[PDB]
Structure formats: C-alpha cells, structure tokens
C-alpha cells in the first residue's frame, strides 16, 4: 500500500511480502525477476535498522551505502559488521 510506519522509503506491505530495488525505487517482487539477477528482500516493517548496523533498510537494499562493503550485506537481514583481529609474527628482546 502507501503506509509507512518506520518512515524509511519502503512501504510496509512490500517489506512484509517482498520487494526489490530497481531505478532507486522499491517495487513489488515478482518471481520473473530472479532470471534477471535480481533478489527478493524482506525485513522488519516497524524498524529503520533491521540488522542493527548503522545503514538503514533502503540504503542497504539499494546499495547507496559505501561501495567497499560486500554484496551479501545488501540485504536488510545481514549486518555489515567487520571482524578485526591482531596476529603476532615475531618478538624482539633488547637487553638493557
């Protein structure tokens, strides 16, 4: 419909059933889109950050966010949260 509770750019019914982003606009998903390479997205219709990451549902779905984050992060249900670690290679001791 035209209702919008979370006040993102995606209507609630589209979030409930399914939607895909084309021409920077969210449209109702049809099963014929899968052969063109499109994807089907579903997310919370009462929230603006379904996954908890700083980017919203419309930003993630449309890819309007940073271009160095992976494609899998573009669906609203996966968080774009980096995992950084530190690994030691060698140790040097300078006797005083």
């Amino acid at each position: 419909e035209d209702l919008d509770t979370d006040n993102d750019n995606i209507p609630d019914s589209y979030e409930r059933n399914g939607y895909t982003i084309k021409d920077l606009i969210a449209v109702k998903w049809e099963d014929s889109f899968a052969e063109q390479g499109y994807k089907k997205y579903v997310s919370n219709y009462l929230e603006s950050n379904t996954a908890g990451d700083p980017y919203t549902d419309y930003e993630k779905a449309s890819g309007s966010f940073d271009k160095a984050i992976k494609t899998e992060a573009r669906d609203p249900l996966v968080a774009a949260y980096p995992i950084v670690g530190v690994g030691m290679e060698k140790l040097i001791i300078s006797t005083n």
Binding site: K22, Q36, G37, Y38, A68, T95
Partner: protein, 154 residues
C-alpha cells in the same frame, strides 16, 4: 626480518604540497631527515646492540611505505579552497574496490591510474563497459592515429 620501528611523519617531515609528477623536497634539494620517533619529535630512534653489530657488518636497512595520509581541496560556500577535514582515506577503499589498476613505465617515468569497471553480476550497475584498449586510451590520454595508440610519440 625484524621491523626496527614504524614512524609516522611528524610536523618536521610533512609535505605541504605534492603535485602529480612532482617530489618533496623538490628536484634540486637534499632529502629530508627522519630521525624522530615520538609524536613531538623529542626522541631519537634507537637500535639494539646485536642490530648494530649486524649493521656494521654490511647489512642494509630497507624502508617500506605501508600507508600515506593526506588531504584534498574543494570549495566552500565562498570561493575559497579549503583542505582541512577532507581526507583521502575515506575514498581509498571505495576507489580500489570498483577500479582496475593500470601502470606504464616508459623509461623511468611511471604512471598509475584507476579506471571504473562495471560489475556484470549486478543488474543495477549502469557504469559503461570498456575494453582494455579504451581504458588505456582514457587513462593515459594517448591519441589514436591509425588504429593504434601513441602516448606522445612512442
């Protein structure tokens, strides 16, 4: 294999300007010294005793540039160029993630360019698709005479 130290450039060793193809210090000037380790240029870089014994026996210390910081310039609400708060580290990864690197030696004068490459697995990527020849022609500004590319005369 031992990294003696990693030092960021303090206020003494910061280049105010570096044009494409230029050099800091400019051509005709001596190299700048880098002999301070702390943040306020109050401490000198130390080395061990075994490291010094290695050094006086002929071994050489190599220098590796891991990363480089810097700013770029744009126009504010007025006509004044402002280069404070603008950084390149915000765009380095985004540029590297969607571009193909091309280099060109041409007798000790290197050129490095990045050209946008279209993703064929994304139906919503509208960036035009280019061949390798078109990318080479665009990046280096080479001209076409008889179906071939000449940089200036080569």
């Amino acid at each position: 294999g031992d990294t003696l130290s990693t030092i960021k450039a303090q206020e003494n060793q910061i280049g105010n300007n570096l044009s494409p193809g230029d050099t800091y210090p400019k051509k005709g000037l001596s190299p700048l010294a880098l002999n301070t380790m702390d943040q306020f240029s109050s401490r000198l870089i130390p080395i061990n005793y075994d490291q010094l014994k290695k050094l006086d026996a002929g071994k050489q210390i190599k220098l590796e540039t891991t990363q480089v910081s810097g700013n770029f310039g744009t126009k504010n609400s007025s006509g004044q160029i402002v280069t404070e708060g603008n950084s390149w580290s915000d765009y380095i990864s985004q540029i590297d993630s969607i571009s193909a690197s091309i280099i060109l030696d041409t007798e000790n004068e290197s050129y490095e360019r990045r050209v946008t490459a279209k993703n064929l697995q994304d139906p919503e990527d509208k960036t035009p698709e280019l061949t390798i020849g078109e990318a080479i022609e665009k990046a280096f500004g080479a001209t076409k005479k008889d179906g071939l590319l000449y940089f200036n005369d080569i």
